Structure 1
């Protein structure tokens, strides 16, 4: 019952820290999670949110959703078939996703069996004391102890959970957790929220809806995807609309009731109403701190609710660290993994390393998708006296032939115009998530715009647009947008 490291949460960050500590530094590791495989009741399980009810199944389902566009687009290239015979079998998709997620769950079980020092414990981890984690039967702190784990080092890696707004009839609504297990594809669905999860699910439901279906996405403010490039926010909005999704901006559910046929009657704050089969809330995710009983050792939380951490993932309590979504910063898997890898290389490697929270590449698997790294221009413009924006936006040739004329590719480079340093790169279109990864490496290397334009293009690709931009489209001078410099 004695460990160098006890990790609460067998997720993206938890397993990276766990595995590394064991395989690289031959350390003695305990990892706690509430479930060994995906789905109800606790949804996240061994592997974490990403594996079970996040990046992995979502990406399989977006890939499934993309075939609605490929089947149509094929016609431009001479593919002929009976379009009246086309059906999207959601039940197939969910069964194939479940098998793929289960195989990963089994994979992690394999990893824990086949690794000296690395041991998995089932149940609910909380903090007894500075150096003891208790595993109980349930999330109730009164439930039975299954284990008392002695820890020289404790890692909090419990991730996040969907926020459900406290409106009348919220019990008629689901989150992404339940979206992954719907037995039938909804004919009419309201996705609530303007972030990546609402956007990605609107695309998924749009592809799998039965005949006479309608996807509506509502967002409480004016323009979806706050924090992304503004040109891309506007374009994603147009491209989702072009593919049949209704975007209701400046709208927010005030209440939901069940109609007598089991459908949902949504009343908006504005007084508008909408009948749907599913209401999926995707308005936020909040760190999972309640169940850890952090009051028992006095781990400090932020005004927001995340575990407060320094640059080395250290809480206010020596030997207690926190990575990933529990810190309520950038809620992405590779960030959690990076923080985990750094924490272990630091503490057990004697090789201190801090995660860089700048210049993080990320994606939205919207149809079509977003790839982005670094600052949007409005943010750059407040930090840098002179910012240049390089922009290329056009419908690629393939999509003129496919008939998807609305699929404008957007490539934007934001620079410090004083030295040419690239501050951010913002892509919308097929392949954007793949294109952006090596751009993340470019930004780590302090690439300038001249490093891009002096590189020889790969032709023909969308990516070569990033190496063809020599002249700013416009600038910000002391925060002020203008076409030309003074």
Structure 2
């Protein structure tokens, strides 16, 4: 006869930044029975993400290590200025060694998270592909093909969709000759010539990475379809980052977009842009965007509605149009950042299972770009602020620090900008570029949630000598926007 399905208060689809924080909190804080589904228990091909999520397996965590590795190129050169001497012709960047180090580090996190499943009562992990068979039934199948064999049918009171996002690949001829960030983490050799396609943080970060590790006579090229990389970021910074990448030897192609790629005789790639221009490279890494990973969930089975862009539509509390079905993290197409997914999962579990309804605040969120040098930022850019306030003030400091006069890296301009509501002094945004920018910016996030005014920044006594003390020496606006237009008046 028949026998019982395994049953849960909460089934989470995707063992990532957001779904792990939800699953953990529901099990350990509210004594719920939780199932969590993911397609792999450790990182890498075939599926790249795995137990742990995108950040842990193929984003924030391995990239940062790789960016840190890339920084030694600068450090070794800059040390001469302080008197370090050594045989410069003996220097070699060993990519294989970096990839192996990073692989070990990620696997340890993978194993560690599996151990925490094994050790936590009421928190179960399920290996495979999850989808919605009906409103309270989650099936887990062998592969993403909806006709592959069912492994388990889970009864679920509540279902959380947290499958994250996936790299956008444009439908152009030869797209199958390109890679994404996923494969970039697994290249067996460092590419000699690479094109990173796109202007966002992922394209920019990997360009620096590839730039540090490329072999003899290699060349890194980045293309973006518009005028100026890093759309969404402060404008001075977009321009500074452009020049500083260039200065470190990276070719920026603005106003270009690939129209197709063919394979050369020798296995390299021959890229033709929309403009008629061409470029031959060993690697084409597409990083033009990430799209909500919804295709495998079978949402039609239950009528979960999407937005026009393709994300799962949700209210401020992460609820879908179907009761007992929720969605958080990249699948919702808000801010695609790990600590927002984390914050979203926690808020959702407080709301549904705790006694503290709460909604995630998506404004004033701090974030970074680990370019070399990095960007740290929190809040509104000046052109956004000008459109929402009658009188905006901009304070700006920008100078090559002294250490970098001695180091020889003179192109390294530090930029600090504070954007105010000039009617009351409220700080709306802070924008930084230069060494340590991502660390400086964290407590600025706390500042904005405290409705800090410019006078709070300037009244604070500086720590000397730092870059950060620039945020506390600015008293006079560099310029303003008055009902939409720039001046010093």
Kindly provide the CA deviation profile for residues 197-228 of structure 1, in whole angstroms up to 9, marking residues without a partner as x.
00000000000000111100000000000000
The separation in 2 between residues aligned to 1:444 and 1:110, in whole angstroms, is 36
Q: How far did 1:253 drift?
A: 1.0
Q: Residue 195 of structure 2: SS of its match in structure 1? A: strand
TM-score by length of 1: 0.99
Q: Residue 439 of structure 1: SS of its match in structure 2? A: helix
The separation in 2 between residues aligned to 1:443 and 1:28, in whole angstroms, is 38
Q: How far did 1:349 drift?
A: 1.0
Matching residue of 2:24: 19
Q: Residue 189 of structure 2: SS of its match in structure 1? A: coil
Q: Residue 21 of structure 1: SS of its match in structure 2? A: helix
Gaps of 5+ in 2: 1-5
The separation in 2 between residues aligned to 1:123 and 1:448, in whole angstroms, is 50
Structure 2 residue 468 is matched with structure 1 residue 439: no
Q: Residue 292 of structure 1: SS of its match in structure 2? A: coil
Kindly provide the CA deviation profile for residues 29-72 of structure 1, in whole angstroms up to 9, marking residues without a partner as x.
00000000000000000000000000000000000000000000
The separation in 2 between residues aligned to 1:453 and 1:24, in whole angstroms, is 42
Q: Residue 387 of structure 2: SS of its match in structure 1? A: helix
Aligned CA RMSD, in angstroms, stands at 0.6
Q: How far did 1:376 drift?
A: 0.2
Structure 2 residue 369 is matched with structure 1 residue 364: yes
Q: How far did 1:307 drift?
A: 0.1
Matching residue of 1:453: 458
Q: How far did 1:257 drift?
A: 1.1
Aligned positions of 1:141-160 closer than 5 A: 141-160=146-165
Kindly provide the CA deviation profile for residues 180-212 of structure 1, in whole angstroms up to 9, marking residues without a partner as x.
000001111101000000000000000000011
Q: How far did 1:450 drift?
A: 0.6
Q: Residue 270 of structure 1: SS of its match in structure 2? A: coil
Q: How far did 1:158 drift?
A: 0.1
Kindly provide the CA deviation profile for residues 142-184 of structure 1, in whole angstroms up to 9, marking residues without a partner as x.
1111111111111000000001111111111100000000000
Kindly provide the CA deviation profile for residues 319-374 of structure 1, in whole angstroms up to 9, marking residues without a partner as x.
10000000011110000000001001111111001000000000000000000000
Structure 2 residue 234 is matched with structure 1 residue 232: no
Q: Which of 97, 100, 106 is the equivalent residue of 1:101?
A: 106
The separation in 1 between residues aligned to 2:423 and 2:286, in whole angstroms, is 44
The separation in 2 between residues aligned to 1:478 and 1:92, in whole angstroms, is 55
The separation in 2 between residues aligned to 1:252 and 1:186, in whole angstroms, is 21
Aligned positions of 1:106-145 closer than 5 A: 106-145=111-150
* Total equivalences in the alignment: 484
Q: Residue 8 of structure 2: SS of its match in structure 1? A: strand
Kindly provide the CA deviation profile for residues 374-430 of structure 1, in whole angstroms up to 9, marking residues without a partner as x.
000000000000000000000000011100000000000001000000000000010
The separation in 1 between residues aligned to 2:207 and 2:488, in whole angstroms, is 36
The separation in 1 between residues aligned to 2:347 and 2:88, in whole angstroms, is 52
The separation in 1 between residues aligned to 2:463 and 2:352, in whole angstroms, is 43
The separation in 1 between residues aligned to 2:131 and 2:137, in whole angstroms, is 9
The separation in 2 between residues aligned to 1:194 and 1:249, in whole angstroms, is 9
TM-score by length of 2: 0.98
The separation in 2 between residues aligned to 1:140 and 1:217, in whole angstroms, is 35
Q: How far did 1:77 drift?
A: 0.6
**Runs of 4+ in structure 1 displaced over 3 angstroms?**
none
The separation in 2 between residues aligned to 1:437 and 1:154, in whole angstroms, is 33
Q: How far did 1:261 drift?
A: 1.1
Q: How far did 1:456 drift?
A: 1.0
The separation in 1 between residues aligned to 2:334 and 2:304, in whole angstroms, is 17
Q: How far did 1:85 drift?
A: 0.6
